[PDB]
Design a protein around this nucleic acid. Structure first.
Ligand code: MG
Ligand code: MG
Ligand code: MG
Ligand code: MG
Ligand code: MG
Ligand code: MG
Ligand code: MG
Ligand code: MG
Ligand code: MG
Ligand code: MG
Ligand code: MG
Ligand code: MG
Ligand code: MG
Ligand code: MG
Ligand code: MG
Ligand code: MG
Ligand code: MG
Ligand code: MG
Ligand code: MG
Ligand code: MG
Ligand code: MG
Ligand code: MG
Ligand code: MG
Lengths: 141, 145, 206, 82, 143, 100, 63, 67
RNA sequence: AAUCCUGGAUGGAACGACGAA
RNA sequence: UAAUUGCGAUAACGAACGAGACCUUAACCUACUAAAUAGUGGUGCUAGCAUUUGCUGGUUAUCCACUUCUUAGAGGGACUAUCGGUUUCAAGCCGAUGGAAGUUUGAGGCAAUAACAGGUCUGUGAUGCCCUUAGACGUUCUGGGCCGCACGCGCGCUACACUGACGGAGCCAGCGAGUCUAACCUUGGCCGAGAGGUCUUGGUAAUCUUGUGAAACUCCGUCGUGCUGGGGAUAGAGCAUUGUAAUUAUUGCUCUUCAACGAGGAAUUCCUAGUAAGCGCAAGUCAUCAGCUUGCGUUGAUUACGUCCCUGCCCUUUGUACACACC
């Protein structure tokens, strides 16, 4: 047994599990490195926590995330949340607390959602319309 | 990737099957100007004639053009699978032709005339000028002509 | 600076844009000081972002959109007129192309260019239907910073869209030339034309 | 059968779809002096069509006259090489 | 260090593998090629048309390398798409089945894919080695 | 001997009472077991116009039946199995046992 | 090309029949000690800033 | 709005009327003794009662309260 | 220790309906 | 105050109904219970690349361990908590910090008294009276019709194109349904351009269909401002399926035909955040037929956070020749 945790990131309906352990610094995504995420722009959106905290903190540790649910953008957001949360869990359990708390402060200074999942969920569809708030169309004459 | 400059061989609007086909646009969608020729038939014949589809119609040889129209008016000889044909199992001889520029509307006419002299429902409907495919006529096709 | 390498090879341009400085897509957010005050505190700069996409929730409270970065506001005001609703990725791509164009032309920072355009195309006076009843007319009034910014973005995007519709120029380059003409002060830009007619009407109805 | 409109027309331009030597050496001399180059530029300037324009951009970028900075489909961007 | 299909981008891999197969020029083509649409929902045939059997073959090889087992039903579900039924609203429609079926037959012939238990088709060691080496070429072209 | 017992009711607390009394019987007899696997409850939805006639505002009504399903796997002699099926039944609860 | 900057110090209330206008008493940044009441079209907070195209005008205060 | 109803207010007033030398200005302990000392069907109503008891104790610690 | 102050408005057009109960 | 919600005032006191409370649902729990019908890791066997440790995978009787993800059950959690302002300084309101969550947390279910001479005897073996009751208005068989078209309205679907159409690759959801004395959802194999056909298989269903590999979307390319590869109505010919039977084409497929439409006048509808809008998907009806509805999720904006100007609602005061009540 070597130091390892497992965390998760979430969005509307996506879930990104993330196994984090000690290794040589490979960051894979469902079979593949982080450079092949295929929006080609939220690739940079997912590089964010790495580029923020500095890649030196990823040399000792390997992350492997499995993602299911949602659509492409939501899978990306689940990925970045699971990554940041797994890093923070590692630095909480195995490394001291000061590194963890400055890491958390950096993440929450840049963007709050990196470590906590947004609360917005779909409102149900109500009859008389196609959506929740919309109604079909009134005709008086 | 490279630009052929050009020669004076280019021609604008040309003629085939009694139709003034426009040049300066690609061959397939140019030949689709011909009645009885659509995008599928045109792409297929331009493939079977060994023609570069990237080329504009206005730069082609009479060899290529006559080969193409030969394939058009005699398709089944050039391994066209007989279900591309607009008129198969025709109505009289059982053979599978392919109608073109004027034959399309003349054959449409004599079909309507067959149905009318038979006094069938579709023929009476056409003769009155109404819709035939069971569509509704209460609230659509008002300004029918 | 350090080039560090991982078990997964992280490229050097991403390493640099990580640890050198926090850029845009590939542009710095410093050297974009606003010269005209009264729009500071409402154009959110000095909070850099790698892309203009964020799942940010600013429409819950009143003045929270002022803390949303202007480029996300521009992307957001791009996706409209129906078919294009949603599709924020296309807006982001169009924006990236547009800022590349505004760098090759007019080699200043394209972010400085767009904020200059915002500052210049902000209607300062505007009208309203006022009265105590039948005595109804178009009385002129001041315009607030936030509505100035919003109306600026609306005018820019609408002009770009109306230009790009039914012609060959891309939405990207229409937006680019519109932004540049606006930042200069042109009277060819849709936004500036609308601005000056609005201001003239306001002047006339004092 | 009313319009509620009148729908005025346009000039119906006549962009070129084949080129020649005059248009070609014109391209070669006039693509320089352009700080930003793409299909819309090479259609509002030199009156080729977009197909010719894309082929010409690939051609020029091959030998190297116009420098790319991003070559996204539906929007190709090029400047002049110093 | 080790290389596989997953460490290389999809589009580039597939283009490389289809070029390899077109240059190899031995796989198969049925004969009804250059006639068909690949799907009831498409309204035109392909535009390349000097190939694209190689592209589909590369794509399904990638797909079976990723997955455990597949079938013509799955591939029709995947390569099918939005059919414009003119005036009525769009809809998902499965693709043409003979195409993918004969693709899998030709790949079984050349020995990239084998028939699997639990029904369907699976990647064998030969195709695995081949695809890995092609991806190796695809990312050592980077130098 | 490898029996499964499934409980496919609507009344959650009656069902849980049955599951509880079964498992305490199992442990007082010292029987190893896979615990109560609570399957996902399934919601039979039925959507209907409230009105018999057609007129009125188009008001709709979604009735639901919640079906809660549980099961437990046991390893035990058939004598204790048959008396187990002899005991532990409730109103409004459908049970079935299956060997192998 | 003269314009006057004015800082908002007090939001009084909404005005106009449809509520799309707000009365505010401001403080001229330049030439301070001067306070004037003005209409505004959009949203506004205290300590915001306004660009008066003309400074010599105040609205009929609703009192 | 966050107005509370007469059920809450009256129940809190009773709890303060006869359990003052007891619960203090902390909602958590006030909750954890109110569930013990009164029987209530709902956790939500319990928490509302406890919050109002805390507010009333805050009132009491600086001057008295009418009623 | 300095120190002068206020309360306040109007504002166009808009015809008609069988009786029975 | 969302609220006859409450502070309080007080010829009223004390109560009830309604609202609220409540119930369901969605969001938090690396705290409890567990789970080859959901997963994860490890170890066995094994494929490939690297070989130097490793990386990606496969593996049913290889077992071992765990429950973060997933399921549920029992519970916890938020009560506007804490702080600062403001108010007779009370109910309460604003802001900030914290927090999963601080618009009664969000959406719904139930939802008062009094009424409409609202709708429905075509849902009722719920029904009074009248009519009819054996060449019946009963019942049933055949064939038509309810689709019928010079026109006028309403709910909607397609689009009027480059933020685009098309061809390739990429490739991601959720709510749910399904066969018994039946014949359902169908995987996989083969044939066929296609629709579809055929040989088998799984499933009474967290297990199989189904990761429902959905669509819009992204990346590459073709086209190139041309009523044009936009648009795909209207027609002709043929091939398949449902069903006893499709002829006024049931539908599906193929080819050909290629009309208006160039952003819509007076008018007018819906909508304040994961909401509008785009996007498709399951179910309902169903032998076949979705352009409809009921729900589902994917992408996801702008603009208010206010007013009573229009249309109306509530409370009070006021006037009234109104009482089937300003029609
Ligand atoms: Mg919707
Ligand atoms: Mg659409
Ligand atoms: Mg354009
Ligand atoms: Mg596709
Ligand atoms: Mg009269
Ligand atoms: Mg009269
Ligand atoms: Mg294994
Ligand atoms: Mg307080
Ligand atoms: Mg509620
Ligand atoms: Mg009745
Ligand atoms: Mg009868
Ligand atoms: Mg009818
Ligand atoms: Mg309706
Ligand atoms: Mg596409
Ligand atoms: Mg699913
Ligand atoms: Mg079309
Ligand atoms: Mg259906
Ligand atoms: Mg029917
Ligand atoms: Mg219906
Ligand atoms: Mg209205
Ligand atoms: Mg009077
Ligand atoms: Mg009277
Ligand atoms: Mg009157």
């Amino acid at each position: 047994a070597v130091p390892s945790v497992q965390t998760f990131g979430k969005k509307k309906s996506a879930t990104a599990v993330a196994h984090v352990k000690a290794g040589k610094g490979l960051i894979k995504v469902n079979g593949s490195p982080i450079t092949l995420v295929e929006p080609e722009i939220l690739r940079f959106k997912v590089y964010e926590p790495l580029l923020l905290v500095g890649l030196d903190k990823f040399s000792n540790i390997d992350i492997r995330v499995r993602v299911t649910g949602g659509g492409h953008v939501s899978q990306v957001y689940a990925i970045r949340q699971a990554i940041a949360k797994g890093l923070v869990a590692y630095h909480q359990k195995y490394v001291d607390e000061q590194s963890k708390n400055e890491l958390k402060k950096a993440f929450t200074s840049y963007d709050r959602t990196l470590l906590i999942a947004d609360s917005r969920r779909p409102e149900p569809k109500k009859f008389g319309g196609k959506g929740a708030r919309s109604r079909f169309q009134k005709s008086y004459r | 990737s490279l630009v052929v400059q050009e020669q004076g061989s280019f021609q604008h609007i040309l003629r085939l099957l009694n139709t003034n086909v426009d040049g300066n646009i690609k061959i397939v969608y140019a030949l689709t100007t011909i009645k009885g020729v659509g995008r599928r038939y045109s792409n297929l014949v331009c493939k079977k004639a060994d023609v570069d589809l990237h080329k504009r119609a206005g730069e082609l040889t009479q060899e290529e053009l006559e080969r193409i129209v030969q394939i058009m008016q005699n398709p089944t000889h050039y391994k066209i699978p007989a279900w591309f044909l607009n008129r198969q199992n025709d109505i009289t001889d059982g053979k599978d032709y392919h109608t073109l520029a004027n034959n399309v509307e003349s054959k449409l006419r004599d079909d309507l005339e067959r149905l009318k002299k038979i006094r069938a429902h579709r023929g009476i409907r056409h003769f009155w000028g109404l819709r035939v495919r069971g569509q509704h006529t209460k609230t659509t096709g008002r300004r029918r002509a | 600076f350090t080039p560090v390498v991982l078990a997964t090879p992280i490229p050097e341009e991403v390493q640099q844009a990580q640890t050198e400085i926090k850029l845009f897509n590939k542009w710095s957010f410093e050297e974009v000081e606003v010269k005209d005050a009264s729009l500071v505190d409402y154009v959110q700069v000095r909070q850099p972002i790698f892309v203009a996409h964020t799942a940010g929730r600013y429409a819950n409270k009143r003045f929270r959109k002022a803390q949303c970065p202007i480029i996300e506001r521009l992307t957001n005001s791009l996706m409209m007129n129906g078919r294009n609703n949603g599709k924020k990725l296309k807006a982001v791509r169009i924006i990236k192309h547009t800022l590349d164009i505004i760098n090759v032309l007019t080699d200043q920072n394209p972010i400085q260019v767009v904020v200059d355009a915002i500052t210049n195309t902000g209607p300062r006076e505007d009208t309203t239907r006022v009265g105590g009843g039948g005595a109804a007319r178009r009385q002129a009034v001041d315009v607030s910073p936030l509505r100035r910014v919003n109306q600026a973005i609306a005018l820019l995007t609408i002009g770009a869209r109306e230009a790009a519709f039914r012609n060959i120029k891309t939405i990207a380059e229409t937006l680019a030339e519109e932004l540049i003409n606006a930042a200069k002060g042109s009277s060819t830009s849709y936004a500036i034309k609308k601005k000056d007619e609005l201001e003239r009407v306001a002047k006339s109805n004092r | 059968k009313k319009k509620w409109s009148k729908k005025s027309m346009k000039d119906r331009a006549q962009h070129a779809v084949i080129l020649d030597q005059e248009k070609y050496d014109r391209i070669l001399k006039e693509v320089p002096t352009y700080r930003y180059v793409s299909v819309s530029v090479l259609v509002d300037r030199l009156k080729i069509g977009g197909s010719l324009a894309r082929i010409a951009l690939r051609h020029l970028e091959k030998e190297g006259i116009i420098k790319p900075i991003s070559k996204h489909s539906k929007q190709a961007i090029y400047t002049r090489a110093t | 260090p080790g290389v596989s299909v997953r460490d290389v981008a999809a589009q580039d891999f597939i283009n490389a593998y289809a070029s390899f197969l077109q240059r190899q020029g031995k796989l198969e083509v049925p004969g009804y090629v250059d006639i068909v649409k690949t799907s009831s929902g498409n309204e035109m045939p392909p535009q390349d048309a000097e190939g694209w059997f190689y592209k589909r073959a590369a794509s399904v090889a990638r797909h079976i390398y990723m997955r455990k087992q597949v079938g013509v039903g799955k591939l029709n579900k995947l390569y099918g798409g939005a059919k414009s039924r003119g005036v009525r609203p769009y809809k998902h429609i499965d693709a043409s089945g003979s195409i993918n079926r004969k693709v899998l037959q030709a790949l079984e012939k050349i020995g990239i894919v084998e028939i699997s238990p639990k029904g369907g088709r699976r990647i064998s060691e030969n195709g695995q080695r081949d695809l890995d080496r092609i991806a190796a070429q695809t990312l050592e072209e980077d130098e | 001997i490898k029996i499964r017992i499934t409980l496919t009711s609507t009344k959650v607390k009656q069902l849980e009472n049955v599951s509880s009394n079964i498992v305490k019987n199992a442990e007082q007899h010292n029987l190893v077991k896979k615990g109560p696997v609570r399957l996902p409850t399934k919601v039979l939805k039925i959507s209907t116009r409230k009105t018999p006639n057609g007129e009125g505002s188009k008001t709709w009504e979604t009735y639901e039946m919640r079906i809660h399903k549980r099961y437990i796997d046991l390893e035990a002699p058939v004598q204790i199995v048959k008396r187990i099926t002899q005991i532990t039944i409730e109103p409004g609860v459908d049970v079935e046992v299956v060997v192998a | 090309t003269p314009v006057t900057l004015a800082k908002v110090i007090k939001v009084l209330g909404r005005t106009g029949s449809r509520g799309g206008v707000t009365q505010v008493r401001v403080e001229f940044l330049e030439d301070t000690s001067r306070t004037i009441v003005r209409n505004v079209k959009g949203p506004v907070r205290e300590n915001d800033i306004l660009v008066l195209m003309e400074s010599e005008r105040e609205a009929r205060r609703l009192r | 709005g966050r107005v509370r109803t007469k059920t809450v207010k009256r129940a809190s007033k009773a709890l303060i009327e006869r359990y003052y030398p007891k619960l203090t200005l902390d909602f958590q302990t006030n909750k954890r003794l109110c569930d013990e000392i009164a029987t209530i069907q709902s956790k939500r109503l319990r928490n509302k009662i406890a919050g109002y008891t805390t507010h009333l104790m805050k009132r009491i610690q600086k001057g008295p309260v009418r009623g």
